[PDB]
Scaffold this active site. Structure first.
Site, PDB file in Angstrom:
ATOM      1  N   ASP A  38      -1.065   3.763  -6.092  1.00 29.05           N
ATOM      2  CA  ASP A  38      -1.938   2.758  -5.507  1.00 29.05           C
ATOM      3  C   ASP A  38      -1.218   1.710  -4.664  1.00 29.05           C
ATOM      4  O   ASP A  38      -0.561   0.833  -5.222  1.00 29.05           O
ATOM      5  CB  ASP A  38      -2.750   2.107  -6.659  1.00 29.05           C
ATOM      6  CG  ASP A  38      -3.651   0.961  -6.254  1.00 29.05           C
ATOM      7  OD1 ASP A  38      -4.106   0.949  -5.099  1.00 29.05           O
ATOM      8  OD2 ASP A  38      -3.945   0.110  -7.105  1.00 29.05           O
ATOM      9  N   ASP A 222      -5.549   0.965   1.238  1.00 30.01           N
ATOM     10  CA  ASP A 222      -5.510   1.126  -0.201  1.00 30.01           C
ATOM     11  C   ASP A 222      -5.623   2.541  -0.718  1.00 30.01           C
ATOM     12  O   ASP A 222      -6.723   3.032  -0.921  1.00 30.01           O
ATOM     13  CB  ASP A 222      -6.628   0.240  -0.763  1.00 30.01           C
ATOM     14  CG  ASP A 222      -6.535  -0.025  -2.219  1.00 30.01           C
ATOM     15  OD1 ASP A 222      -5.645   0.563  -2.872  1.00 30.01           O
ATOM     16  OD2 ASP A 222      -7.379  -0.770  -2.725  1.00 30.01           O
TER      17      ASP A 222
END
Ligand SMILES: CCOC[C@@H](CC(C)C)NC(=O)[C@@H]1CNC[C@H](C(=O)N(c2ccc(C(C)C)cn2)C2CC2)[C@@H]1O
Ligand SMILES: *[C@@H]1O[C@H](CO)[C@@H](O)[C@H](O)[C@H]1NC(C)=O
Length: 336
Positions: A38, A222
């Site tokens: 992430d 993201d």
């Protein structure tokens, strides 16, 4: 910064186009975990054997048992990780982590509190934060900074490929890019500032008109986010323009209308990044009697990072992404 001549790749599994996870080994002998990588966060965590079994997510996930690791080093500092989707709590531990063949001593969170919603829906066990130390909870050195410190990687960069679903689910390259998964040239956009994988966005078009982000906005790039997201206000306008209907957690269109929806363009750096309805609609049928979800939702990200858009897996599937730490920039190329 010391550079070597090594690149390391992590093969990812694509679960339903929403979760892209790879495998990491923790401890001696290694305890294996399925993890999401992430760029929106900077901590490493996996569920702990110290997690009460009253948390059903701990019953259903792989747990780290420090008592089975000869390389474990106690820390115990309490840590809470508050994501936009949910929260985990636990404590810090140190151990040897293996990621794509690279072995690194890493401080990570052993999670003892893992809420059933959303974590019972996670195919992955934990998360490997690919963000900067500035966003690390507890000022813990992130894994990529520790890998860079080894001076083995050819370049201070990492790249993401996410497939659209025998086929490779995805791939992360540490230390470079894989030209087998992109075409044309990378177009780079500089970060607004070091510490966050966020860039300036000059506008969002729904059709041929820039109805959103007219005076500029922010885009967090993201990899841990399943969807493209914007503020409630921006998404209400986007969805009004698509004729989509708001539900509790998502937006839907009648399945038959899915292929009629306009293109959505994201103006980043010197280029328009266009998604057709095939790129953002979960087209499960063509039935006029069924509802089809969209891979775009509302998410109000609080300051200092937010209010911001987030370009998650929906975006990355179309555009192979390079995260460049040496130059504080993000490169995009058409995924192949
Ligand atoms: C406090 C540390 O977090 C930093 C924070 C900063 C942001 C808001 C700018 N960071 C974040 O909020 C993360 C940014 N990237 C996407 C993440 C995500 O959505 N996760 C997620 C994905 C799927 C599911 C399933 C179970 C359905 C659960 N969680 C995984 C990381 C947990 C989080 O939103
Ligand atoms: C945990 O790690 C921090 C960071 O260096 C350190 O200051 C602290 O003393 C550690 N705690 C224990 C009990 O090892």
């Amino acid at each position: 910064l010391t550079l070597g001549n090594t690149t390391s790749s992590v093969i990812l599994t694509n679960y339903m186009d929403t979760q892209y996870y790879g495998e990491i080994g923790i401890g001696t002998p290694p305890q294996t975990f399925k993890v999401v990588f992430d760029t929106g966060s900077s901590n490493v965590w996996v569920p702990s054997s110290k997690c009460s079994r009253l948390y059903t997510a701990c019953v259903y996930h792989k747990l780290f048992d420090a008592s089975d690791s000869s390389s474990y080093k106690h820390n115990g500092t309490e840590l809470t990780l508050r994501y936009s989707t949910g929260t985990v709590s636990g404590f810090l531990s140190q151990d040897i982590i293996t990621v794509g063949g690279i072995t690194v001593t890493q401080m990570f969170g052993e999670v003892t509190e893992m809420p059933a919603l959303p974590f019972m829906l996670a195919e992955f066990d934990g998360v490997v934060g690919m963000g900067f130390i500035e966003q690390a909870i507890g000022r813990v050195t992130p894994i990529f900074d520790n890998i860079i410190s080894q001076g083995v990687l050819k370049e201070d960069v990492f790249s993401f490929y996410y497939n659209r679903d025998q086929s490779l689910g995805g791939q992360i390259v540490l230390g470079g890019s894989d030209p087998q998964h992109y075409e044309g040239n990378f177009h780079y956009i500089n970060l607004i500032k070091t510490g966050v994988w966020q860039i300036q966005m000059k506008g969002v078009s729904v059709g041929s008109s820039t109805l959103l982000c007219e005076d500029g906005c922010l885009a967090l790039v993201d990899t841990g986010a399943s969807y493209i997201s914007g503020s409630t206000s921006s998404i209400e306008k986007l969805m009004e323009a698509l004729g989509a209907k708001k539900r509790l957690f998502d937006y839907v269109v009648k399945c038959n209308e899915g292929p009629t929806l306009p293109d959505i363009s994201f103006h980043l750096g010197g280029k328009e990044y266009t998604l057709t309805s095939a790129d953002y609609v979960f087209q499960e049928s063509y039935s006029s009697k069924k509802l089809c979800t969209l891979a775009i939702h509302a998410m109000d990200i609080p300051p200092p990072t937010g209010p911001t858009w987030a370009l998650g897996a929906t975006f990355i599937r179309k555009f192979y992404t390079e995260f460049d730490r040496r130059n504080n920039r993000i490169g995009f190329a058409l995924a192949r």
